[model samples]
Target: GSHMYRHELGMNYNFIRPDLIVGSCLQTPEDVDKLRKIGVKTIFCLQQDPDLEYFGVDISSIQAYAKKYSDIQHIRCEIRDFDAFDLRMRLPAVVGTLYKAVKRNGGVTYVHSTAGMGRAPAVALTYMFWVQGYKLMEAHKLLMSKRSCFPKLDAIRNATIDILTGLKRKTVTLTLKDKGFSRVEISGLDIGWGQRIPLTLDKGTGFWILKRELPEGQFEYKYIIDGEWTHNEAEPFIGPNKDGHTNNYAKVVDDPTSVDGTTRERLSSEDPELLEEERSKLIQFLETCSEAE
Candidate 1:
C-alpha cells in the first residue's frame, strides 16, 4: 500500500490516453521516447519532486528531451496528498489553468503525479468537473475507467464545488424556441474552449444556459443547435475567427465586491463579515495558485 503502488505503473505515465493521460511520472529513457512519439503536446505534473525516479531513471530528464521535441510544453505543479493540500492554493486555479490549456492543444496532454494514482486522478477528474459540470462522484467514475489510477480525498471536492460556485459568474443562455433536431451547445474559438460546453434546457421556457466565466474580460463566443454550430441571434456578435465566421461576444467584469449584489438579495441571512473572510481565503488561494502559472 505504501512504498510504490506497483512496479509497472511507475515505469511510465502510460496507462491510457484518449485526449488526456492520467498516470505515473515517466521513468525510463524508452518511456521518454515513446512519450515523444505519442503526439503529447502538453504535460501537467502534480508532484512536489521533479527529481522523482522510476526504475533508476530520473523523470526530470524529460526536460532535456523536450528541447528536441520543441513543440511540447510541461507544466509542473507540485502537490502532496489530500491531508496537506490547501484547496484555496491548488485545485480550482490549477484545474482552470489546465482546462484553459487543454482547449488550446490539438493533441493529448499527459496528467500525472508521482505514482499514477492519488493526486493524479484528483486533478484529472477535476478537469471533467470543469468542462462538463459533472458532480465529483460522476466524474470520478468516468475518469477512473479511462486511467489506471484512484482518488483518495473526498473533502477536496468542496474546493472543486466552491471554486466554481464562489466565482461571480454570468451565464449565457441559448434558447431553442424554434430550432429542430436534437441538442444545443456553446462552441466557438473566439473565447475558445477545446470542446463544447453543453447548455442545459430550461424546459417549457425554451431556453438553454451555458456558462461563460473565463478571462474575466471582453471576448467573443458562439453556440450550437441540433448538431449545427451557429451564432446567437440575441447576444451581441463579434468578429470572424480563422474561418472568417463571426460569433457572439461579451465582457466579464472584475468581481471586486466580497458579495454579489444579486446573490446577497436572495440570501438575507448571510453574515456581514463572512464574505470578506471567504473572499480573502479565495483570493489568497488564487494568488498562490496563479504564482505557478
Candidate 2:
C-alpha cells in the first residue's frame, strides 16, 4: 500500500517536534531502531571511527536491520581530513551521495558530524549548491536559518564559488547589429563570479537579451527591467529569493545575448546647468568615499 504508514507519521512527528529530540548524531542502538521503525530509507554516515571517536555506534546492528528491512540503506563516506584542502575534494562526493540517496528514497537525507556544525554544514551547502541549485550566499543563509549551530566555513564558501565559476567559463558570443545605431556593440556575455555582463536590447522595443556564462555549478541571476531587477518568469531554474519575491535562476542557453538596441540615445556633452549638477554630485560622492576610506 502507498498510504502513509506509522513510520512516516513518526518521522513527521519527529520533524515537527524536534525540541524533544536529544541529538542529531546517529549514535545509540535505540536511535538506530527508531530510525528503522520510522522507515528511514537511507543513512549517510560521513564519519570514520578513527576520526570521530563515537562513529561506529551500532554499525553492525544497523547493517543487520538494513538487511532485514530491504527498504533501509546505509552509506558511509569517511572524510579523511577536516582541513580545507582535503575537504574541497571530499565535499563533492559526500554531497553527491546524499543527493542520490534523497532522490532514490524520496525522503530527507540526514547529515551529521560530531556537533552537527562544520563538516556537516559544508556538505549541506554543497548539496544545496550542486543539487538544489542554490547560490553560495543563498545556501549559506538557508543553512543558517535551519540550524543556528551551522558554522561559517570559509573554505566551503570558497570551494562553492570556485565550482560555480568553473561552470561559467564557457562563453557564447552574440553579434547583434542594430539599425541606425553603430555606437552600441554588445560583446562578452559573461555571467561568472556573481556579476552580469551588459545585455543587448532590441531596437524600438524594451525587450532585452542578457547573456551570461553559467558553469556546471549553481548560479543566481535576474534581468533588469526598466532599471529594476526582475526574475525571468518564463524560464526559472531554481526557487525564489529569501525575500520570497524574486526568482533565482535560468538554465543554460546557447546564446543569451542576441538582441539589438531598441532605443538609441546619442551621448552629448552635458548642458551648462546639468554640468554643474554633475560636478556637485561627483564631489559629494568623492567626499563620501573618502570618509569611508
Candidate 3:
C-alpha cells in the first residue's frame, strides 16, 4: 500500500511531505553522503550508543562523517529505547530539528535510529501531532500508509494523546527591538499583571521586552510608544480589535525554530494559537500561498 521504494533504506524511509524524510540507521560515511546527495541537510541520531552498529554500516560514526561535510548538522539525543527517558530526552529535539529543517530554505531533514521503525517513527508521528495538528489516530493512519515497515508502537500513540490533551502552558517573549524610540511599552489583553503592562527597556537595543508564560493561543495588543498606541513593527500579522483600534497580532503554537532562523521566542511554538475561525482563515491563506508553488 506504500510507495515502498525508500523502504530499501531499511525499515522505512518515509518522505513525510516534501522536505522531511525519516529512515533507519545510517551505517557509513557513504550512506550519510548518499543522503546529502539527495538533499538532506540535517541528520538527527536517536540511538543510545555513539557506536551502535546497524547493518554493515557503522551507525555511530556519523559524527566523524558530519565533520567531513560542511552542510550537514548531526544531532544526537541518546535514549534508552522506549523508556520514559526516551520520551523525556529524545522526543523534543527530534521534533524541533524536523520542524526547523522544514523551515530552512531548501532545507531537508532525516531522522533515524537502528531500525527507523520504533523510536524514529514514534517521535516523527508526535511531531505530526504537534505541528500538523493531527490527532493521534490520524497520524497513525497516515504513517501506516507511508511506511510499509511502520511499527505499531501503542505506547507512543497513547503517550502522544496524553501529551496533546494534557494542555501545558508555554512561555513566550515579545521583543520590540531597534524601533528607534525613546520610551516603549507593551499592552495587551493577556499582558502580564494588567491589560497594559510596561515592558522593560533594553537600553542598548532600544527594545521593549516582555516575557510571559501563557496558554497556547493567539494574542493582540499594541505598543504605547511615548503614550501613542501603535502596532508592533516586528509582528507580521495585524488586525483590529473590539475597540476598533488596529492591533498587532502574534501566534503561539507547538513548533520550533523555523527557516526564518527564528530562535524559538521561548523554545516552542509560533507567534500564538488563535480562535478556530481565525486560525483556519490564516492557515488556509498561508497554505494556499505556499502550496500553490
Candidate 4:
C-alpha cells in the first residue's frame, strides 16, 4: 500500500516550482538576516501599505531592514480590488520592472500578499506570463497548483488575455527601406479566424515581425506614433479603432498563401483604379448591413 497525504482547503503548497518562498508576514530584522543567509536577493511585496498595519509590520520598515542584509526590491502593487483596465494600462511598465529585477540579481523572486493567496498569485501569474510566455489559462493553472490560488476579480484574467492577444498580432512587412526603420505600408491586417488569428503587417523590425493566422475579412488599422494615434497617409483606406478613431485600412487576402513567405507584398496608393474598386466594395458591404438591421 502507498501512503498519501492530504490537507484542508487553504493549506500552503508549492505547485509551480523554481524556488518559490513565502516569507512571514511579520518578517523582522532577524528574519531578513536569515533570508540573506539563504541567498534570497529579490523580494516582491504584494500587500498595500495601509494593510501592513493589520499584520503588525510596516512596509517601509520591512524595506529598510531587508536592505541592510540583502538588496531588497519592493514592488508596491496592491492585490485587493485589482483593476483590469489599470492592469492593461500599466502592463508594459510592470513587465519591464520585473524583467530588470530578474536580470539584476541571480536569485529567485519571493512573492507575498497578506496570506500569500490572492494578490500574491496574481502578481506571480503576471511574472509567469511575461517570463515564460505562458497563456493566461496555462499560467493560472500552474499557479493554482502551487498555492491556494483564487482570483478575486474577473477582469485580471481578461486583462491578461487582452495583453497576450495584443502581443500576438504580427506585423507583416510590405517593404523594407533600411534596417529597423521603414515607411508604413500597412498595419493591423487579419488573415484567419478562430482560437488563433494570424495577423500580418508590412512593418519591418526584428522585434515587430510576426506571423498570425487571422480571420478572412477586411481589417483596418494604423501606426501608433510616439503614443499618438495617426492614420497611414501612404494608404487611402481607413479603419476604426475601438475608441471610435478611424485609421488606414488593408485587406487580408483570402488565400492562405497570397503573399510569398519571407517577403512582403507591395501595393501603391497611386493606383487610383484599384483603390476605387476596394472602396466601392466596402461601401456596398456597409449598406447591406444597414438594410439587414
Clashes per candidate (backbone, < 3 Å): 2, 9, 12, 18
TM-score of 1: 0.50
The TM-score between candidate 2 and the true structure equals: 0.44
Per-residue C-alpha lDDT of model 4 across residues 169-267, encoded as one tens digit per residue: 334343212334332233344321111222233434343223434322234555543334456555555545334667554454433443321111222
Instruction: Name the TM-score of candidate 4.
Output: 0.45
Q: Tens digits of per-residue lDDT for model 3 on 105-202?
A: 34677877667766777777766656677655676777778774444343343233223333345788787775566766776635321336667877
Q: Rate residue 253 of model 2 by lDDT.
A: 32
Candidate 1: residue pairs that collide? 24-116, 88-285
TM-scores of the models, in the given order?
0.50, 0.44, 0.46, 0.45
Question: 1-293, model 1: which lDDT tens digit per residue?
Answer: 33556655545554344677776766654565666677777777776652364245455576666656666767777665433234223677777567666766657888877777777777776665445445556666676676555564332444533553454446544444445436777654222333466777776666676654442334555677777778877777876654578877665554535445334332222211234444455445444434335
| 34-129: candidate 2 lDDT, tens digit per residue | 666655666666566653453345566655656666666666776543344345545645555665566666544555554455566677666654
Pitting candidate 2 against candidate 3, the one with the higher lDDT is 3
Q: How accurate locally, in lDDT, is each candidate?
A: 0.57, 0.45, 0.57, 0.45
Residue pairs of candidate 2 with colliding backbone atoms:
167-215, 167-216, 168-215, 191-213, 201-260, 202-262, 203-261, 203-262, 204-262
In model 1, which regions exceed 4 Å deviation? Answer: 1-4, 7-17, 50-60, 82-84, 164-293
**Pairwise lDDT winner, candidates 3 and 4:** 3
